[model samples]
Target: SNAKIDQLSSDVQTLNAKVDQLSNDVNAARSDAQAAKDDAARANQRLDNM
Candidate 1:
C-alpha cells in the first residue's frame, strides 16, 4: 500500500512555514546581540572617560 507516502507528502507542506520563521528569528537575535554589544562597549568607554 502506498498509503504512507500519501501522508508523508501531506505533512511535507507543514514544514516550510516554521523554517522561514526560524530564519527570521535567528537573524533578529543576531542583530539584537550586535546592538547590545555596541551599547555595552560605549558604556564601558564612558566609564573609563569618567
Candidate 2:
C-alpha cells in the first residue's frame, strides 16, 4: 500500500491555489480598468463644465 497519495494531493492543492490567484489577478485588472474609465468620464465632464 505504498501509493503516492500525499504527493498527488499536495500537487493538486498547489495547482488549485495557483488557479485561484490567477482568477483574483484577472478580477483586479477588471476593477482597475473600470476605475480608469470612470476617471476618464469624470475628467470629460469637468472639461465640459469649463
Candidate 3:
C-alpha cells in the first residue's frame, strides 16, 4: 500500500512538470503571434498613408 502511494506521488510530480512546460510553450507562442499581429497592423497603416 505504501508503494502504491509513492508511485502515485511520483506520477503526480511528473504530470505537474509536463503541465508547466506546456504552459510555457503556449505563452511563448501567444507572444510571438501578438508580435506578428502588431507588425502587420503597422504595415497596413503605412500602406493606407501611401
**lDDT by candidate, in order shown:** 0.91, 0.96, 1.00
State every prediction's TM-score relative to the real structure. Answer: 0.79, 0.65, 0.81
In model 1, the runs with Cα more than 4 Å from the true position are none
Candidate 1 per-residue lDDT, tens place, 1-50, comes to 59999888777766777788999999999999999999999999999999
* 1 versus 3: better TM-score goes to: 3
Cα RMSD, model 1: 1.5
Tell me the RMSD of model 3 versus the true structure.
Answer: 1.2
Ranking by lDDT: 3, 2, 1
> Which should have the higher TM-score, number 1 or number 2?
1
RMSD of each: 1.5, 2.6, 1.2
Q: Which candidate is the best by TM-score?
A: 3
Ordering by TM-score:
3, 1, 2
Q: Which candidate's lDDT is highest?
A: 3
Residues 1-50 of candidate 2: C-alpha lDDT, one tens digit per residue: 34598888889999999999999999999999999999999999999999
lDDT of 1: 0.91
